[PDB]
RNA sequence: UGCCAUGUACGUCGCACUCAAUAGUCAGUUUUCUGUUUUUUUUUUUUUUUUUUUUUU
């Protein structure tokens, strides 16, 4: 997968219920180096999905969320300026459309 | 206020009520339903009814 993000700039992941690619590609976007420039907007369809999965990796990292990796869905403005990973819903990017048009502020949109 | 010449012709009769009775002509297969009273009123205005599902500076 690392290699696949590092020489292509569409990737797609295909995983089942049990797989863990929800969890570990912003690690792996991490691990190239993603994050540093733009942030890593990782997509999601239910708030407490994003909330779940935000948090989840948080722990994985052993940071408190809110820091390295935060999510914002309606008005959990949940993110600090040391932030590289951000959650966030279709809606919450269609939001951001108008106010960037460039998606300037990522690098990687999941 | 005196006189008035003579003889001179008759008979008998009829009418009514009525009139009756007559020629010939044999037969018609069996079976059937149809049939009767009685309580009477038939007829009365109604109602609210269920739900995949998921995201938005």
């Not at 809110?66 to 008005?75: A, D, L, S, T, W």
Request: glycine share 10%; charged share 25%.
């Amino acid at each position: 997968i690392l290699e696949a993000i590092r020489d292509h700039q569409v990737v797609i992941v295909a995983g089942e219920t049990g797989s863990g690619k929800t969890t570990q590609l912003p690690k792996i976007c991490m691990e190239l180096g993603r994050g540093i420039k733009g942030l890593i907007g990782h997509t999601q369809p239910r708030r407490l999905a994003a909330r779940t999965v935000a948090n989840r990796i948080a722990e994985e990292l052993k940071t408190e969320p809110g820091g390295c990796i935060g999510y914002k869905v309606r008005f959990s403005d949940h993110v600090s300026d040391n932030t590289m990973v951000k959650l966030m819903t279709d809606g919450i990017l269609l939001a951001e459309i108008q106010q960037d048009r460039l998606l300037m502020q990522y690098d990687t949109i999941i």
